Write a protein that binds this ligand. Sequence first.
Ligand SMILES: CCCCCCCCCCO[C@@H]1O[C@H](CO)[C@@H](O[C@H]2O[C@H](CO)[C@@H](O)[C@H](O)[C@H]2O)[C@H](O)[C@H]1O
Ligand SMILES: CCCCCCCCCCO[C@@H]1O[C@H](CO)[C@@H](O[C@H]2O[C@H](CO)[C@@H](O)[C@H](O)[C@H]2O)[C@H](O)[C@H]1O
Ligand SMILES: CCCCCCCCCCO[C@@H]1O[C@H](CO)[C@@H](O[C@H]2O[C@H](CO)[C@@H](O)[C@H](O)[C@H]2O)[C@H](O)[C@H]1O
Ligand SMILES: NC(=O)c1ncn([C@@H]2O[C@H](CO)[C@@H](O)[C@H]2O)n1
Ligand SMILES: NC(=O)c1ncn([C@@H]2O[C@H](CO)[C@@H](O)[C@H]2O)n1
Ligand SMILES: NC(=O)c1ncn([C@@H]2O[C@H](CO)[C@@H](O)[C@H]2O)n1
Ligand code: NA
Ligand code: NA
Ligand code: NA
Lengths: 404, 404, 404
Amino acid sequence: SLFMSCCGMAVLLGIAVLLSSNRKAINLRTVGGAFAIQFSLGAFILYVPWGQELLRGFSDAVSNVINYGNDGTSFLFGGLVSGKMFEVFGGGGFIFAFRVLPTLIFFSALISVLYYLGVMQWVIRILGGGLQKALGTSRAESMSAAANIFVGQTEAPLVVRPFVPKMTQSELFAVMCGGLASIAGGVLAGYASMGVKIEYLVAASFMAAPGGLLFAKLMMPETEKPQDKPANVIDAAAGGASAGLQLALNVGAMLIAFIGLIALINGMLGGIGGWFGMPELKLEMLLGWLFAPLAFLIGVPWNEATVAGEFIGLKTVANEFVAYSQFAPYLTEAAPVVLSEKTKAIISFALCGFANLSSIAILLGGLGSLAPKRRGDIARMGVKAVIAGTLSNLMAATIAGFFL
Amino acid sequence: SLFMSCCGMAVLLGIAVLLSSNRKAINLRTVGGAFAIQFSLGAFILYVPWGQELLRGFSDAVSNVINYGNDGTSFLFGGLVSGKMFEVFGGGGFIFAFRVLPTLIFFSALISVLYYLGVMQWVIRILGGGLQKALGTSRAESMSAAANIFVGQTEAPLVVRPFVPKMTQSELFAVMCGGLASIAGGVLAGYASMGVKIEYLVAASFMAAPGGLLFAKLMMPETEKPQDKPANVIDAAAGGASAGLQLALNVGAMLIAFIGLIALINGMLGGIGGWFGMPELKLEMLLGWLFAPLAFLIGVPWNEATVAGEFIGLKTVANEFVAYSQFAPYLTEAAPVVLSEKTKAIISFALCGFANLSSIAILLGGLGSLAPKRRGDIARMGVKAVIAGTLSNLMAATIAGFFL
Amino acid sequence: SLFMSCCGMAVLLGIAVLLSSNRKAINLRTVGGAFAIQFSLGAFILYVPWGQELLRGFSDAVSNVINYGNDGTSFLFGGLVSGKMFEVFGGGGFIFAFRVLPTLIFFSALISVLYYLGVMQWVIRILGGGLQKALGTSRAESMSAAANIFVGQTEAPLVVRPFVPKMTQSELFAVMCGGLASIAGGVLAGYASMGVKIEYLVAASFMAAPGGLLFAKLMMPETEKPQDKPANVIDAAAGGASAGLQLALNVGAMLIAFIGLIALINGMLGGIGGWFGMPELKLEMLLGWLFAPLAFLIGVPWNEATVAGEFIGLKTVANEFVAYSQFAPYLTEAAPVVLSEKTKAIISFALCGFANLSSIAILLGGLGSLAPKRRGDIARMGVKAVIAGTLSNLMAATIAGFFL
Ligand SMILES: CCCCCCCCCCO[C@@H]1O[C@H](CO)[C@@H](O[C@H]2O[C@H](CO)[C@@H](O)[C@H](O)[C@H]2O)[C@H](O)[C@H]1O
Ligand SMILES: CCCCCCCCCCO[C@@H]1O[C@H](CO)[C@@H](O[C@H]2O[C@H](CO)[C@@H](O)[C@H](O)[C@H]2O)[C@H](O)[C@H]1O
Ligand SMILES: CCCCCCCCCCO[C@@H]1O[C@H](CO)[C@@H](O[C@H]2O[C@H](CO)[C@@H](O)[C@H](O)[C@H]2O)[C@H](O)[C@H]1O
Ligand SMILES: NC(=O)c1ncn([C@@H]2O[C@H](CO)[C@@H](O)[C@H]2O)n1
Ligand SMILES: NC(=O)c1ncn([C@@H]2O[C@H](CO)[C@@H](O)[C@H]2O)n1
Ligand SMILES: NC(=O)c1ncn([C@@H]2O[C@H](CO)[C@@H](O)[C@H]2O)n1
Ligand code: NA
Ligand code: NA
Ligand code: NA
């Protein structure tokens, strides 16, 4: 029952200790409180009545913003995003290119506006300051952890960019982990528009900040000594839309290619598998069979561990967007396999992160531009940082499955 | 009657004098003839029979070019831009993304071709030379004023780019105003494809050249002494299409975000307004209530000044494309408020310009690349140049409403 | 009969000799074997039974990859690329923007993956090595010729980029010709998705390598002495998709503008032609009337030479994509003119190449970045290289028409 989840949390923490750069340098106050906060945050908003109300209230607010933003895409694509599409094409009336991708553009503009007004910096300063006074983590890495709750792995460190070039290896590693353990507000609204429960997305986003610091300081403890704009609001929104546009185009092209490549791989795996008596062999079978123990470890029932492994594995070997795209049909009435409500939550939390190998190249470019003489350190800690981000997503999923 | 319009022209001229850098340095020949030309041009093509025929002939030619260009977008999007769309989705069959945006790509290619052939430079040389010999304005600033009739605020100064780095503050300011007082051929065809009368777009475009110089020399008189390519036609069209593509994407992303943001703002203004007994409070109400006196000043009837204020205000606080998008439904039979034919003309002329705050950032980049050591002067005169461009659009609207 | 084709091959070879930089420097072994290989390759896969089976087997494999890739675009655009589109919009249900353009993105990703795995370099090394040992051509120019079978004129020389800055004028010219005589894998799949027979596309692609070297060494014989990466497979696919996206957007914008411009030109040619009693005058008539002798020379029947001239001429004065777009309707049952199966093949082969004037500007940029001090030589040999690429496409078409 609940004993299997507590063992899951132990195993995840155990792997991080085994992969630590210095186990004897691990600060118990830091990693103790970091786990305590992520666990309590999960308890607060998933179990305790008052916390569940604050979570649904924030989620409904996010759901209202998305609909407001949908007026913009409704103007551009007219009846191609109306209800008539379902009357004509049925299930195929939901055009992803026009339904989900424009949301990335709107939310990028909105966040850019909330930065200009000082609203974002105000919230980050409070959350980031609460983390450092309770974990003993440095000023810059704590703000980046808080910033990552709302924005991407490359946009988050911008709040502390003059401190990035001279921050310690442990600090840089935590900044990398904070980004890999989290997503961004734009894609969050995208996944929400695909049927993923907003309550799970917001919850996983907030639990990412302490969870990112947790496995960052476990696998890479501090062994050194740390230290310590658009002309108007309309230009801010315009720049945000432009950034969101570029992101929308890149994500869309990636989904065409990656899903397309998977179909090719399944075609080849059908012929190759046939040589060994398994003509029905596909990529989903391999990933499911290989990630089932991991899925079972974090609280997924034995008879649903294989299916849950397909989604978790796909997120790791590719990215979470491709995973969410294959998992989204399982959140409707036309789902090929009816999953338990707890299993749906676990998959949602475990997927909610940028933790993949391809995000290292993005970290080399974005975070590397902020500190060109540190690109060597970024490339070196890349794989370890992905693992740390992965463990954070898995821990948040285990915690979520526990209180559910 | 016609006395209210003449007072409107006086007020607009009065504001420019009050905001002048040196009222005693204002050349009466310059600003006298500049107003005389813009007024006579309005009289010529809106009142006098022969002029009305030349205007409708040019407009029909423009209307034919758009339809020719529509073969290109018809090929790409097929039945999504056919008549069947109206039979299925009704009013929502008109897909803006495919109906209006591709036109920016085609017209950008066409203008780029007309530049290679020397046709554009031929027309600009004649118009620009007629302005300088009648106003005493310098060679470079006069050609830029003429060029702005057809192309954008960043593309226009390219005809005099080696003279830009060393031109006077008054010259640079006029170049900025010429761009803010006008639009570009590409978006012109876009607005025309949205239902805006081509006769009003072409008229406002041509009246922009003397109107731009008018308020430029009023608010910033000359106090110094002025001075004085693609391999083939197929490469020209290709480069133009590429430029138009980038423009199409940026405009589209902006419309998704801005309209989306407005819907969010109206949602918040509904809740905020409710605290003061006004739950129906929206952005359109604020802009209408605040710009109604201005609209009434330029010839809009008292019972239509509020609605006309919504569109004019929106163009100022954002951009003219967003304004035109909200005004376009009022040009159909399904209009929520039936406006007089004169009011429709006034709104069309007053909107027809790039005069907004966000265009300053664009002027810093485009016009700034032509003279990197002058970006300081551009940022300094930015706001004054927007005001001057705004007054030009308002003057052209007052003149248009007078002869109508 | 077959005597007219052999004369066609003679004429094409004759023109190249007349335009040679040094006829006395022409290596007979080189150009003899180069023609012998291109002719035998045509004989092998178009006439001989075993070769026809290898060609249809490779083509069916390519056809399967396209369908696999179509899962990606099906996900993005849903019912807009389903069969329901034909039930509602009829013929206009086939939306080019969603049916053809996404294929460029998928195939770019795939090729980028096959490069990372070493599969591409393996095939190129074998083909390129077979060409040099039989023609005496240098190492670098032979690999580039082989690489061009699969990728574009700018991507092909990347396999020998450190040898490009110091290769001879004859070597650089051949590298240019190898790209102009061929297309790329991405657009190949596009043309295939437009109804062009894959067997003809693959055949023309492979015959491009010896055909490119043939007319390169004919028009520019060697008179000097020659000499002699993404972190993971997922980053490779992502970079390929990004590149393919940029290509998709540029091609799409070009088709909107160029087709749009043609409609404008036909409108003007109707009015201009009317002055000389020919109001029905169009661009297709001019190109057909002017390229009919050329079409008749390469094996097109007298009563089909005019129509075939329209497509061949359009490919030359613009690009092969615009030509294929106008030729594609003639490959369906709703064709305005029913052409013989041999004529359809000849048009397909003669169009299958990047040989146009606009590709010179692309060669200046892409190939020029690999050797910035050689941009002068590229601009100088530009026109000659286009002619050489044109003659290669025409030769392959003559050979194809001969064995058919
Ligand atoms: C859509 C619905 C909501 C409506 C919102 C409309 C209100 C926006 C007002 C703009 O704010 C000002 O704009 C200036 C221009 O962008 C800025 O000046 C700055 O930039 C100018 C030009 O670059 C300079 O002249 C100034 O000195 C410099 O302070 C200035 O900082 C900024 O406060
Ligand atoms: C679609 C319907 C209408 C059909 C129109 C077709 C006609 C176009 C003809 C192209 O014109 C020439 O093209 C050359 C190549 O672009 C240019 O040469 C220039 O560029 C070459 C290569 O860059 C050099 O070799 C030359 O010396 C240099 O003068 C040259 O200036 C230009 O006049
Ligand atoms: C979608 C279905 C198919 C599933 C396929 C999944 C398998 C992919 C495995 C990735 O391969 C490795 O990834 C590393 C990271 O990209 C590379 O390390 C390189 O890059 C790292 C970070 O940049 C460094 O830490 C390493 O030392 C450096 O060798 C490494 O070369 C590469 O072999
Ligand atoms: N805003 C950002 O920084 C961002 N957004 C998306 N992605 C990348 O795109 C993938 C799919 O969302 C993720 O795994 C990230 O690596 N990065
Ligand atoms: N061609 C150009 O230079 C151009 N086109 C459009 N815009 C900008 O986009 C806004 C909407 O058209 C305008 O106010 C301009 O600031 N600039
Ligand atoms: N991959 C490439 O290098 C490429 N692809 C397309 N084109 C250019 O675009 C035109 C239409 O396909 C061709 O003639 C080329 O000049 N180049
Ligand atoms: Na983040
Ligand atoms: Na202009
Ligand atoms: Na090629």
